[PDB]
């Protein structure tokens, strides 16, 4: 069950005396004509709560007056409960008889508690407060005698705009209209330029660890997805960077170092490690940035295999990336640490040069005739994309107008030209007869098509809603523009 809080839940926002003045204030108020829950039960507590009846537990317990958490001791029963910066504020008024008629609630008590309440129970109407702007009319005695919710409707907006509870006939701008984006698209050229990783990971012939081979990889995208989801990688580890972020960063160059070692030897190809390979055949620097990939390659190497060489003796230690001997002799039957592993090390080089090696760029579909957020090949903007009748030269990617603002772009995948128009916006004005004759208004959306705004008359000036269009000309009264005027008959006409 719900009721209509016609004109209730308004309270004095502060301890300041005001007289014979109209004041605009922003605070947590119950909106006018809200749906207030009617009880005959535990309620949520949000920004604040409106409560009325014809004790409470918030654990802040108010039991009739004893209040305890901290301790403090001191017809329609109308209350407001809010808490800000640790203060639990209670507002209250008691009147004879939700009913109609405006009344503001005086402050009852400010309790310096310092607790966050999100639920409460009553031991009967419950409403909620929210951030809204209210206009308040004070009399000579400092009492609030009336109020306007500046967000309730277009006439209330007009009253707040003009700082008055009475509006003279005319047209007034009260707010702006602006169409928001509904989607977001990113478009990039569909990439075929993938890094030659096949010759690193799917090759037949590899150098041995004592004198390992390398490839220099440039002018491509590294499709890391193919490598980390490989059906046969026993290990994959990155230093200085997480695998899941590799597609968001671009290196100057990357290098693929490849060699064959035995299974239990693979833990030596890492920074900070020492051992037969780490010191004698492949030194991996402690400041290494890159990814190490390794797997069991038995099926393509081992024989029923004194082919791959490594060293037992070298007079001095190796320094990073340099390239007595023994053969591995890999055998089909061994333990997991004793068959061959194929190892690929992808080092990442970043220096003072244009970046060359990136991940693939993903694209979304193309949205037309709607407001979107967009970027085409790196250039951002927002607006409505439509087919263009313009012709770009073969090397041009986007165009600009007289004021050097993006006017159009080329679709990087199909190369059609798309115009970018602004999302409509404009002042919104209220066309009103004087308040002394009528309290209804018509609303005009300046330079807005009526089909995109959400008795509608589309005019040159804008979209006019609420006024009817008639074929009779009259002397003007409230001017709109472009030859159109409005007046009040028994409704508003244009």
């Amino acid at each position: 069950a719900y009721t209509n809080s016609f004109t209730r839940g308004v309270y004095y926002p502060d301890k300041v005396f005001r007289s014979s003045v109209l004041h605009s204030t922003q605070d947590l108020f119950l909106p006018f004509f809200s749906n207030v829950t009617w009880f005959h039960p535990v309620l949520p507590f949000n920004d604040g709560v409106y409560f009325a009846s014809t004790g409470w537990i918030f654990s802040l317990l108010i039991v009739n007056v004893v209040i305890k958490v901290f301790e403090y001791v001191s017809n329609l029963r109308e209350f407001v409960f809010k808490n800000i910066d640790g203060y639990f504020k209670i507002y209250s008024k008691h009147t004879p008889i939700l009913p109609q008629g405006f009344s503001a609630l005086e402050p009852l008590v400010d309790l310096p508690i310092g607790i966050n309440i999100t639920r409460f129970q009553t031991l009967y109407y419950v409403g909620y407060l929210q951030p809204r702007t209210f206009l308040l009319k004070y009399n000579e005695n400092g009492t609030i005698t009336d109020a306007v919710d500046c967000a309730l409707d277009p006439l209330s907006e007009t009253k707040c705009t003009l700082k008055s509870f009475t509006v003279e006939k005319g047209i007034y701008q009260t707010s702006n209209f602006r169409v928001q984006p509904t989607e977001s698209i990113v478009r990039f050229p569909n990439i075929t330029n993938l890094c030659p990783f096949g010759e690193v990971f799917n090759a037949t012939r590899f150098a041995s660890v004592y004198a390992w081979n390398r490839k220099r990889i440039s002018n491509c995208v590294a499709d890391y997805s193919v490598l980390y989801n490989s059906a046969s990688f026993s290990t994959f580890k990155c230093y200085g960077v997480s695998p899941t972020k590799l597609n968001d960063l671009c290196f100057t160059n990357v290098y693929a170092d490849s060699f064959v070692i035995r299974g239990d030897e693979v833990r030596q190809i890492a920074p900070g490690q020492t051992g037969k390979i780490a010191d004698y055949n492949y030194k991996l620097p402690d400041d290494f940035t890159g990814c190490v990939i390794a797997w069991n390659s038995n099926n393509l190497d081992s024989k029923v295999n004194y082919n791959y060489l490594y060293r037992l003796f070298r007079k001095s230690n190796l320094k990073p990336f340099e390239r007595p001997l023994q053969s591995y002799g890999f055998q089909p039957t061994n333990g997991v640490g004793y068959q061959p592993y194929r190892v690929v090390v992808l080092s990442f080089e970043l220096l003072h040069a244009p970046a060359t090696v990136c991940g693939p760029k993903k694209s979304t579909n193309l949205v037309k005739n709607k407001c979107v957020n967009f970027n085409f090949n790196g250039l951002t903007g927002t607006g409505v994309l439509t087919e263009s009748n313009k012709k770009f030269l073969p090397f041009q990617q986007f165009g600009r107008d007289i004021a050097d603002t993006t006017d159009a772009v080329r679709d990087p995948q199909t190369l059609e030209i798309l115009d970018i128009t602004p999302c409509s916006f404009g002042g919104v004005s209220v066309i009103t007869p004087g308040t002394n004759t009528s309290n209804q208004v018509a609303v005009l959306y300046q330079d807005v098509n009526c089909t995109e705004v959400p008795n509608v008359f589309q005019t040159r000036a804008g979209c006019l809603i609420g006024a009817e269009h008639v074929n009779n000309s009259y002397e003007c009264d409230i001017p709109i523009g472009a030859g159109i005027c409005a007046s009040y008959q028994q409704s508003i006409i244009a």
Partner: antibody
Amino acid sequence: VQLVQSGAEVKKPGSSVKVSCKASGGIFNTYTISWVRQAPGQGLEWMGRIILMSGMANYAQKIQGRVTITADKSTSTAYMELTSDTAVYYCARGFNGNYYGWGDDDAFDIWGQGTLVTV
Amino acid sequence: VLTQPPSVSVTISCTGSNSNIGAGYDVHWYQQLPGTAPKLLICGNSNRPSGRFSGSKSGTSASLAITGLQAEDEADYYCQSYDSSLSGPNWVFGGGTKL
């Protein structure tokens, strides 16, 4: 990160069981999920590990052919299922403080609650 | 399987072979309280997560050192390492020591 497993259940001996495990905490540094079991009064036994990215899994030899592990990326879960004991089955993510990704020298840092299955 | 003493009244030993501990592979340590999943206390040779403990390797053996008879930490302690034998990768937990 948090790994939530299934509750206890009873199956007839010789039948099959499917145990889920959802890494609802984040999933941003989780590359692999391992399964370990502990029979009452016993120590822990590794059963298998699945790499979430590739979908590949390795298994302990003693249960090979009667165990499968499936990685469902769309739900961030790993399913441990057995065909044909009363052990507790634990779900744990692999982790190494020296590198990102997965390998042999990693460890099981964050463990789930343990799902018991009995006959 | 890694060999451990049934109980310790101190240090908890863990003895393996050159296929797992003497292999150079990291030996991790866990503390399992009854009623729940094991908690990691050592990663790698001797690193630890937030929340008394140290350790080292020697030959094919490794050990966990716990110092101070605090509270009643009567947990089941386990060592874990990678085994490089059989016919494929596998991880091995030790027998388990009651403290």
